[PDB]
Symmetry: D2
Subunit: 330 residues, 4 copies
Amino acid sequence: TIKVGINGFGRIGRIVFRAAQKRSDIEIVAINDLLDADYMAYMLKYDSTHGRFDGTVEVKDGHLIVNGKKIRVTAERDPANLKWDEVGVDVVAEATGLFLTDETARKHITAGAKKVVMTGPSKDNTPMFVKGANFDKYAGQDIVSNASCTTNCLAPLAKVINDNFGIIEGLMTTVHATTATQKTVDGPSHKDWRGGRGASQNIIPSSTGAAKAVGKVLPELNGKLTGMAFRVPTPNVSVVDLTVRLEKAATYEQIKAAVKAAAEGEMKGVLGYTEDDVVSTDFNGEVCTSVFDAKAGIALNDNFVKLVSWYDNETGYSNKVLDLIAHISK
Amino acid sequence: TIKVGINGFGRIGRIVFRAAQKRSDIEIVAINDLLDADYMAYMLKYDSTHGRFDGTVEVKDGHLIVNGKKIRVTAERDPANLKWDEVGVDVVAEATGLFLTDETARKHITAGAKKVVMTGPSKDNTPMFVKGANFDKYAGQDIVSNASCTTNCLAPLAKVINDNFGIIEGLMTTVHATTATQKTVDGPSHKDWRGGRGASQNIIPSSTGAAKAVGKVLPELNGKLTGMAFRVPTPNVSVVDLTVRLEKAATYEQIKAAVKAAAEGEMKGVLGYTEDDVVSTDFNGEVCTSVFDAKAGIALNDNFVKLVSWYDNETGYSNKVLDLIAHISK
Amino acid sequence: TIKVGINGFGRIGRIVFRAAQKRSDIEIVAINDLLDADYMAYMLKYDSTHGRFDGTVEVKDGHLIVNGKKIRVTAERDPANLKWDEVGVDVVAEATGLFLTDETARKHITAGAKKVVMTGPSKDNTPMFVKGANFDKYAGQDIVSNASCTTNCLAPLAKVINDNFGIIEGLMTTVHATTATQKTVDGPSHKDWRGGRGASQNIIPSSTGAAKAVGKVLPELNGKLTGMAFRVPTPNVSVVDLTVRLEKAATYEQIKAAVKAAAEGEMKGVLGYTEDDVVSTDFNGEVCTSVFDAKAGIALNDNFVKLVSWYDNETGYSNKVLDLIAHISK
Amino acid sequence: TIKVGINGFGRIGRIVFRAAQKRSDIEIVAINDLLDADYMAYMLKYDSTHGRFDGTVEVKDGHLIVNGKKIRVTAERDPANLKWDEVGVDVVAEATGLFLTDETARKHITAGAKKVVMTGPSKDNTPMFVKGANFDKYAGQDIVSNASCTTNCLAPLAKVINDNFGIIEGLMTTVHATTATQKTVDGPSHKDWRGGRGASQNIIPSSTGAAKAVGKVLPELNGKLTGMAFRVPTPNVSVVDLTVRLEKAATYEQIKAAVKAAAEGEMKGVLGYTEDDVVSTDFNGEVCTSVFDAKAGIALNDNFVKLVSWYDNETGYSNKVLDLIAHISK
Ligand SMILES: NC(=O)c1ccc[n+]([C@@H]2O[C@H](COP(=O)([O-])OP(=O)(O)OC[C@H]3O[C@@H](n4cnc5c(N)ncnc54)[C@H](O)[C@@H]3O)[C@@H](O)[C@H]2O)c1
Ligand SMILES: NC(=O)c1ccc[n+]([C@@H]2O[C@H](COP(=O)([O-])OP(=O)(O)OC[C@H]3O[C@@H](n4cnc5c(N)ncnc54)[C@H](O)[C@@H]3O)[C@@H](O)[C@H]2O)c1
Ligand SMILES: NC(=O)c1ccc[n+]([C@@H]2O[C@H](COP(=O)([O-])OP(=O)(O)OC[C@H]3O[C@@H](n4cnc5c(N)ncnc54)[C@H](O)[C@@H]3O)[C@@H](O)[C@H]2O)c1
Ligand SMILES: NC(=O)c1ccc[n+]([C@@H]2O[C@H](COP(=O)([O-])OP(=O)(O)OC[C@H]3O[C@@H](n4cnc5c(N)ncnc54)[C@H](O)[C@@H]3O)[C@@H](O)[C@H]2O)c1
């Protein structure tokens, strides 16, 4: 049993919590956000996207009792005041989206935690890991990042394609679901003007470093990929549209065979494969971080192809956050 | 020319600004928010709901030049530091949604303004006015409130019905468009748990004092009305569903005749009337604050009827804010 | 087990099929629609609203094999040519929405079925039964109707209120989710002009006979209720807003006490009760046909109140279709 | 003036009608569809996407009177029985989407019309013309096609890029608004299974021949482009995402310079250029068929870039249908 403490009970914090209930090796013993225990119990119980929590949630004496287990609840705005050691926290899932550098996240280690896993791309040199891409390179570091949802989708796919055919260069577009940082109606978003426009009314272009980041987890692809994003009016589930130029010519059939083989072997549980007429909602709740859509992709010729891969930006990522926690715990 | 200064360039501040361009008696000479002049120019220029601004917008030396006219731009968080007198501001349209009491709004008068019009229901005893209901009671007060969008819809209708048939009692439901206070995905809303749930995914019940407030503008209806609201996934335009018990029996035809007559006489420009098969988008940009939908209403009997009335929560209200400004300016 | 055959594998037909899987007493043995087995398998497997089918579905020799059981598949456009004889069908869930009269629905009896349950309100005098309102009135009829989803929500609530406090008169509004009947963009809808307007962009007023239909399942309420609907931009789950005038004075606390009592007693499984800050998505998958929202309702006085009740228009109703099938087969 | 007759008063037929009102050279004198004059008047008057018709529309003796001009109204399901002779129709805007071949469309010539413009891509070899790409190639043909909305967006852009830097190969994706073809809720769509899934709930992968179709209006690009689409939850306005490999090295600044030059010169009115932080709604009502988004695009290197261009799939295209009508009538 690895004892985890969650900082930031948001979309990711809550989905990591629900995913943890199905794992015997990991156990959440404390949660911090800036909310009351009864309000947190409410956000755990009901979810517009994923449905009602299956289990019991009761608030007793300012703490949560979920399925019998007692969970310490705090509302400390500063991580240094979390006292993770009081509850015996081994690893902390840093999910606020505010402490993405070694110095801010290190506060949890000062507070008594042993290791920290950021649930977003680090903003400094903190190493990023993506399952299926470079977990094996982990060298015992105490602060680590699980990268972004888009990088978790792109990397495993990019790896299989490169290994078999060699990527000369590629450009990616992610059609992404609306997130907590957007607005309901045209509002202020000083650092992202487009991002402040009404989410339900618009297709909103957005820049993203998720493609370039693949170079950090798969060094051999460094400098060969980049891309952008379009935010669209759906509440969850996104898709990667990767246009790549191949070194070795490969028919679309050969590409499908390579992906399927990896989906069934080395990357089972990370990379998925499908030939069904799927749409985004079909992946709501999906745990695989990259699901190759065989019928959506199209090849101009044997060396220039467009590949499509689905990912539940909330669920797949959250499950891999747990995987990384177990991994770094040996 | 009445010189107006806008505090809070939000949905209401921006729509009041655009409506003012079509009025010769009123002129905006200054705007305050917590944004840069170039960002404000951007929010003025493009609107997801109402389209591009028709006119020229240029940012010169930290100020706006709209259709030739220079408009002072400030970003003072505290109203007491606005120096409205420097630009000769007569009336201020208080549109931040934060200064709804005499003492907070009075800061604008300290800052050099002569009168203040709140664009929301006052939270204290500041008098509320609704065009078609009680503008004639205005007695020279310096701080005034234009009430809420729902009250502006309900009051003129309630008045005509009461005058002709006498309201014994009534309960109102407003199916309302999503607003800036809601969330894109399930998030924190400590003072309104339902209001924090994903806006595009849900029908969200909400309490509202808009019905009871009709009693403040039409004292004779005090204690006879109340209601609630359902927030739905549309970006603009709302509708009042009023269930009333009548003193004098009246056929639905008689009710239509009374409303139409008022729409064409005493309440022209405030109360509208229609017999078309309309839907919400048909009122996007509507200036009348209450548009009676003759075909949507239904009568159980001559003394118990359900009446339906549309209102563009942004445009109708903004236009009446301007009307009140002119009214109080004599 | 009762062998059931489904005619019309649409939204209701499909949800009835899923619900039946969780019942030991009912068993679906044949399905009819105008689609190939492969397409039917795909529609069962994937659902945008309810998620992926919980089980295995294969196609073998033009027939479905769901969870190992063979299910005869057909494409007869005429009920008479269905041969329910062969497959041993006892009751038919008539879900096409085309045969809502004895004349047409009786073709299933001709075709070998013993009884028929229409999944919509009968257009002739075929008796309608609503669980919680009049199942006890069933008198051996071979063709019955399960009324509509809205009536299934309103009846159980209206009975509890009437029985305890006496409903003098009431007017209802249902804020309803979008249905297959609507258009994605402004299109032709000859029968109902408002209904052809873009579903996602509008609040669309609509007529409904659901309130009057209550008078047929609860005669004591005949002529005392009527209402209308507002179709809004959500994919599933609706809510009734009932404004009633009470004979016996009752405080909101007493109304709550009565409803809660019925929910835990005589109407267990039909009428639910909640005091949480729920929103529409919290009922997606809900089995009870009427879930009373304690906190959403509001009373003007002891004899005039607004009551709010939720219902998953697809799931609750479908489970009740199965309940009626069990009932008329006792 | 050119007297035009419209066949198919759908989205395109209606928007072509509105656009024609703003043109002195074209004049609509007759409309045909399978709807009554009253219903047609209602559909013209109210539009969920484009607002209320700017003018007067009356029905008199089963015919429309728009802005004082009489417009013959008909309901012939067969083109041959249209008698365009009587009304003096020169060109027919064939917008039903049913007659996309010479064989079928020629019935209008039989019926008295001089020429025909199909508002969709021809299914046979009827030549296609795209303003900005090959209008200059028109050689007197009496039946021509205006291609599709997507091709109208892609062609002008592809020509400017190819002419200046040489396109070796390209792969495109169009993130497209919802169309009348889609379903509001999971429904039957035999031809395209993904297309029957709930439009509002999903990102739906789709095929498109628009990229290949570029090869027919710009032969030099035949076999060098192909692509796909993603249908998303918005009512109007789409965007092409073009990933191309350049023969001649060009920096993004040089690509911008070339596009801006074409927008202000040879392609004025067809191809637009912008550097603002625009989103989809900013193009609702846009006349240019391809608006280059300078800031959204991204280059990996001097020979591999992603270009982004916006288009109001209804308005731009409709204005171009009028341009082609003017062109083939010179
Ligand atoms: N939403 C996704 O699809 C997704 C996927 C992968 C990674 N992420 C990343 O994970 C992080 C969280 O994103 P989210 O979508 O879950 O956001 P969110 O806004 O839903 O969650 C943020 C939570 O942190 C809480 N919080 C804010 N300040 C806090 C503080 N000082 N101390 C403790 N708690 C605080 C908030 O109250 C909130 O509940 C971000 O880095 C985001 O980029 C998001
Ligand atoms: N949206 C509607 O339909 C509607 C209709 C009628 C009345 N109202 C009311 O009007 C008010 C504004 O609502 P809105 O929807 O326009 O909101 P909004 O959030 O769109 O506008 C608020 C604006 O005020 C600015 N602001 C915040 N703090 C400020 C400060 N201290 N100083 C200056 N500017 C500041 C914000 O940056 C923002 O641009 C509220 O009282 C609201 O209830 C809204
Ligand atoms: N969906 C709801 O919210 C709801 C709730 C309660 C009752 N109902 C009722 O259920 C019935 C169907 O509604 P729905 O929502 O399932 O609609 P739907 O359009 O999804 O289902 C209709 C199905 O019937 C099939 N069909 C059509 N003609 C057929 C024929 N001649 N023979 C066999 N199959 C045929 C169609 O292929 C389609 O799959 C209606 O009476 C409706 O009023 C719907
Ligand atoms: N809407 C877009 O985004 C778009 C863009 C470019 C091209 N188009 C094309 O325009 C054509 C129509 O598309 P739409 O979007 O206008 O669809 P739509 O369904 O809105 O319009 C079709 C219209 O044709 C009418 N109609 C059907 N049969 C008829 C008949 N036999 N005789 C007369 N009228 C008949 C229908 O009543 C309907 O009003 C198609 O070829 C489509 O590909 C559409």
